[PDB]
Write an enzyme that holds these catalytic residues in place. Structure first.
Site, PDB file in Angstrom:
ATOM      1  CE1 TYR A 256      35.874  40.028  38.850  1.00  0.00           C
ATOM      2  CE2 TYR A 256      35.496  41.430  36.911  1.00  0.00           C
ATOM      3  CZ  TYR A 256      35.787  40.169  37.474  1.00  0.00           C
ATOM      4  OH  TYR A 256      35.978  39.047  36.665  1.00  0.00           O
TER       5      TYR A 256
ATOM      6  CG  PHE B 153      35.604  44.272  30.124  1.00  0.00           C
ATOM      7  CD1 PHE B 153      36.218  43.504  31.113  1.00  0.00           C
ATOM      8  CD2 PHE B 153      35.863  45.619  30.091  1.00  0.00           C
ATOM      9  CE1 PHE B 153      37.057  44.077  32.042  1.00  0.00           C
ATOM     10  CE2 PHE B 153      36.700  46.199  31.022  1.00  0.00           C
ATOM     11  CZ  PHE B 153      37.302  45.423  31.998  1.00  0.00           C
ATOM     12  CG  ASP B 154      34.055  39.656  33.966  1.00  0.00           C
ATOM     13  OD1 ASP B 154      32.974  39.150  34.348  1.00  0.00           O
ATOM     14  OD2 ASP B 154      35.146  39.090  34.152  1.00  0.00           O
TER      15      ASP B 154
ATOM     16  CB  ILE C 281      45.881  43.974  35.383  1.00  0.00           C
ATOM     17  CG1 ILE C 281      44.533  44.339  36.059  1.00  0.00           C
ATOM     18  CG2 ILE C 281      45.666  43.073  34.191  1.00  0.00           C
ATOM     19  CD1 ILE C 281      43.534  44.995  35.119  1.00  0.00           C
TER      20      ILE C 281
ATOM     21  CE1 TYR D  81      44.436  41.176  31.105  1.00  0.00           C
ATOM     22  CE2 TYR D  81      42.841  42.979  31.299  1.00  0.00           C
ATOM     23  CZ  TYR D  81      43.310  41.716  31.707  1.00  0.00           C
ATOM     24  OH  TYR D  81      42.655  40.986  32.707  1.00  0.00           O
TER      25      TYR D  81
ATOM     26  CG  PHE E 118      38.168  46.910  36.786  1.00  0.00           C
ATOM     27  CD1 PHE E 118      37.575  45.672  36.680  1.00  0.00           C
ATOM     28  CD2 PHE E 118      39.255  47.190  35.990  1.00  0.00           C
ATOM     29  CE1 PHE E 118      38.050  44.725  35.779  1.00  0.00           C
ATOM     30  CE2 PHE E 118      39.748  46.255  35.096  1.00  0.00           C
ATOM     31  CZ  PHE E 118      39.150  45.022  34.991  1.00  0.00           C
TER      32      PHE E 118
HETATM   33  C1  LIG Z   1      44.156  30.674  33.873  1.00  0.00           C
HETATM   34  C2  LIG Z   1      42.857  30.466  33.751  1.00  0.00           C
HETATM   35  C3  LIG Z   1      41.874  31.608  33.864  1.00  0.00           C
HETATM   36  C4  LIG Z   1      42.037  32.424  35.168  1.00  0.00           C
HETATM   37  C5  LIG Z   1      40.670  32.921  35.497  1.00  0.00           C
HETATM   38  C6  LIG Z   1      40.118  33.068  36.717  1.00  0.00           C
HETATM   39  C7  LIG Z   1      40.811  32.732  38.004  1.00  0.00           C
HETATM   40  C8  LIG Z   1      38.704  33.631  36.723  1.00  0.00           C
HETATM   41  C9  LIG Z   1      38.730  35.165  36.924  1.00  0.00           C
HETATM   42  C10 LIG Z   1      37.380  35.627  37.493  1.00  0.00           C
HETATM   43  C11 LIG Z   1      39.078  35.942  35.641  1.00  0.00           C
HETATM   44  C12 LIG Z   1      37.871  36.210  34.730  1.00  0.00           C
HETATM   45  O1  LIG Z   1      37.287  34.993  34.259  1.00  0.00           O
HETATM   46  C13 LIG Z   1      35.865  35.105  34.039  1.00  0.00           C
HETATM   47  C14 LIG Z   1      38.185  37.133  33.543  1.00  0.00           C
HETATM   48  O2  LIG Z   1      38.342  38.450  34.100  1.00  0.00           O
HETATM   49  C15 LIG Z   1      38.328  39.516  33.159  1.00  0.00           C
HETATM   50  O3  LIG Z   1      37.100  39.530  32.429  1.00  0.00           O
HETATM   51  C16 LIG Z   1      38.459  40.754  34.012  1.00  0.00           C
HETATM   52  O4  LIG Z   1      37.481  41.412  34.319  1.00  0.00           O
HETATM   53  C17 LIG Z   1      39.778  41.163  34.473  1.00  0.00           C
HETATM   54  O5  LIG Z   1      40.384  41.898  33.721  1.00  0.00           O
HETATM   55  N1  LIG Z   1      40.264  40.751  35.663  1.00  0.00           N
HETATM   56  C18 LIG Z   1      39.615  39.845  36.620  1.00  0.00           C
HETATM   57  C19 LIG Z   1      39.476  40.479  37.987  1.00  0.00           C
HETATM   58  C20 LIG Z   1      40.837  40.899  38.489  1.00  0.00           C
HETATM   59  C21 LIG Z   1      41.441  41.857  37.483  1.00  0.00           C
HETATM   60  C22 LIG Z   1      41.596  41.283  36.070  1.00  0.00           C
HETATM   61  C23 LIG Z   1      42.729  40.292  36.066  1.00  0.00           C
HETATM   62  O6  LIG Z   1      43.866  40.638  36.388  1.00  0.00           O
HETATM   63  O7  LIG Z   1      42.470  38.953  35.697  1.00  0.00           O
HETATM   64  C24 LIG Z   1      43.584  38.063  35.647  1.00  0.00           C
HETATM   65  C25 LIG Z   1      44.231  38.120  34.276  1.00  0.00           C
HETATM   66  C26 LIG Z   1      43.420  37.811  33.053  1.00  0.00           C
HETATM   67  C27 LIG Z   1      45.551  38.438  34.222  1.00  0.00           C
HETATM   68  C28 LIG Z   1      46.350  38.516  32.947  1.00  0.00           C
HETATM   69  C29 LIG Z   1      47.021  37.151  32.778  1.00  0.00           C
HETATM   70  C30 LIG Z   1      47.954  37.112  31.586  1.00  0.00           C
HETATM   71  C31 LIG Z   1      48.970  38.249  31.642  1.00  0.00           C
HETATM   72  O8  LIG Z   1      49.710  38.212  30.421  1.00  0.00           O
HETATM   73  C32 LIG Z   1      48.301  39.618  31.799  1.00  0.00           C
HETATM   74  O9  LIG Z   1      49.294  40.656  31.916  1.00  0.00           O
HETATM   75  C33 LIG Z   1      48.906  41.823  31.163  1.00  0.00           C
HETATM   76  C34 LIG Z   1      47.379  39.642  33.012  1.00  0.00           C
HETATM   77  C35 LIG Z   1      43.049  36.666  35.971  1.00  0.00           C
HETATM   78  C36 LIG Z   1      42.236  36.667  37.282  1.00  0.00           C
HETATM   79  C37 LIG Z   1      44.173  35.617  36.018  1.00  0.00           C
HETATM   80  O10 LIG Z   1      45.020  35.932  37.123  1.00  0.00           O
HETATM   81  C38 LIG Z   1      43.688  34.177  36.201  1.00  0.00           C
HETATM   82  C39 LIG Z   1      42.919  33.654  35.018  1.00  0.00           C
HETATM   83  O11 LIG Z   1      42.998  34.245  33.951  1.00  0.00           O
HETATM   84  C40 LIG Z   1      39.479  39.330  32.171  1.00  0.00           C
HETATM   85  C41 LIG Z   1      39.408  40.400  31.088  1.00  0.00           C
HETATM   86  C42 LIG Z   1      39.534  37.872  31.595  1.00  0.00           C
HETATM   87  C43 LIG Z   1      39.417  36.818  32.692  1.00  0.00           C
HETATM   88  O12 LIG Z   1      39.326  35.501  32.117  1.00  0.00           O
HETATM   89  C44 LIG Z   1      40.606  34.990  31.741  1.00  0.00           C
END
Ligand SMILES: C=CC[C@@H]1/C=C(\C)C[C@H](C)C[C@H](OC)[C@H]2O[C@@](O)(C(=O)C(=O)N3CCCC[C@H]3C(=O)O[C@H](/C(C)=C/[C@@H]3CC[C@@H](O)[C@H](OC)C3)[C@H](C)[C@@H](O)CC1=O)[C@H](C)C[C@@H]2OC
Ligand SMILES: C=CC[C@@H]1/C=C(\C)C[C@H](C)C[C@H](OC)[C@H]2O[C@@](O)(C(=O)C(=O)N3CCCC[C@H]3C(=O)O[C@H](/C(C)=C/[C@@H]3CC[C@@H](O)[C@H](OC)C3)[C@H](C)[C@@H](O)CC1=O)[C@H](C)C[C@@H]2OC
Ligand SMILES: [Ca+2]
Ligand SMILES: [Ca+2]
Lengths: 113, 113
Positions: free
Chosen positions: A33, A43-44, A63, A89, A106
């Site tokens: 992605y 951003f990623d 998300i 978010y 995305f």
């Molecule tokens: C726990 C330890 C870290 C753990 C990290 C990994 C497994 C590594 C994984 C590649 C994530 C990336 O790490 C480089 C990085 O991906 C981003 O850059 C991104 O592109 C993104 O948006 N993605 C990732 C791809 C799927 C969609 C989305 C997501 O849904 O991601 C999920 C997310 C952040 C959900 C929030 C969680 C909090 C709620 O409150 C909120 O509800 C509103 C939703 C991620 C996968 C979480 O399930 C699990 C984690 O976070 C984020 C901008 C910040 C994130 O780093 C944190």
């Protein structure tokens, strides 16, 4: 290709139709992605980190726009998701890199189911 | 390369040392594999089905020799596992293709963690 707006307000577009197996809720899927803000700031990218991303589709860990938007893709497909903040978010934003009330773009490539 | 015999009786050999991230229990990993009986009959290949295999390492869903043998691999690595029947399908065997009391030989390539 068409742009589909779903009941949730999610929009998606299949830039490339996959020829392989279909993604459904319950499966563990693997994708590449890239994520951008609507102003074009990246951003990623999992491709930049050389690290395919695996998750449980419909698992409530990503998300809302992803759990919804990735369902129906076929392996090999590239789908563009336009995710309104209530399916991303929200008011809170994320990591100081995704601002409050951000619409997210995305491009998702399905690698495996 | 060396052959390591573990406390369980598992044997493994790193045919190719990976250069990337290390696999540990808890991670969802993705691999290609081929499986043979000791007489050289192939019973499976994920490469032939064009379908990488994902599982939760240490999740208790795969045979014991896999949950044990895949831990410590690095991404890019190819490890050969020689699994005695008590860490495989035991007296029961499987699918009419793996006989009772079969030692199993797998070659496992780690694609992602
Ligand atoms: C726990 C330890 C870290 C753990 C990290 C990994 C497994 C590594 C994984 C590649 C994530 C990336 O790490 C480089 C990085 O991906 C981003 O850059 C991104 O592109 C993104 O948006 N993605 C990732 C791809 C799927 C969609 C989305 C997501 O849904 O991601 C999920 C997310 C952040 C959900 C929030 C969680 C909090 C709620 O409150 C909120 O509800 C509103 C939703 C991620 C996968 C979480 O399930 C699990 C984690 O976070 C984020 C901008 C910040 C994130 O780093 C944190
Ligand atoms: C439920 C629906 C099917 C579901 C199938 C998939 C997700 C598709 C997945 C690619 C499996 C393959 O499907 C083409 C196919 O892989 C084999 O050919 C094979 O190479 C093998 O040995 N593998 C697969 C790779 C990991 C190691 C080992 C295994 O541990 O596999 C596990 C296994 C069979 C464990 C038994 C389970 C019963 C216990 O009683 C026994 O305890 C002694 C241990 C598999 C992954 C199970 O967790 C899940 C499933 O079975 C088997 C020879 C037969 C098996 O098809 C069934
Ligand atoms: Ca990964
Ligand atoms: Ca797969």
């Amino acid at each position: 290709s068409t742009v589909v707006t779903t009941e949730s307000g999610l929009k998606y577009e299949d830039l490339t139709e996959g020829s392989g197996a279909e993604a459904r809720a319950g499966q563990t899927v693997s994708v590449h992605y890239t994520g951008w803000l609507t102003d074009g700031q990246k951003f990623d990218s999992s491709k930049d980190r050389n690290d395919p991303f695996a998750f449980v589709l419909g698992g409530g860990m990503v998300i809302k726009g992803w759990d919804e938007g990735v369902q129906g893709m076929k392996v090999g497909g590239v789908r563009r998701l336009t995710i309104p903040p209530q399916l991303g978010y929200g008011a809170g934003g994320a990591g100081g890199v995704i601002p409050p009330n951000a619409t997210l773009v995305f491009e998702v490539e399905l690698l495996d189911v």
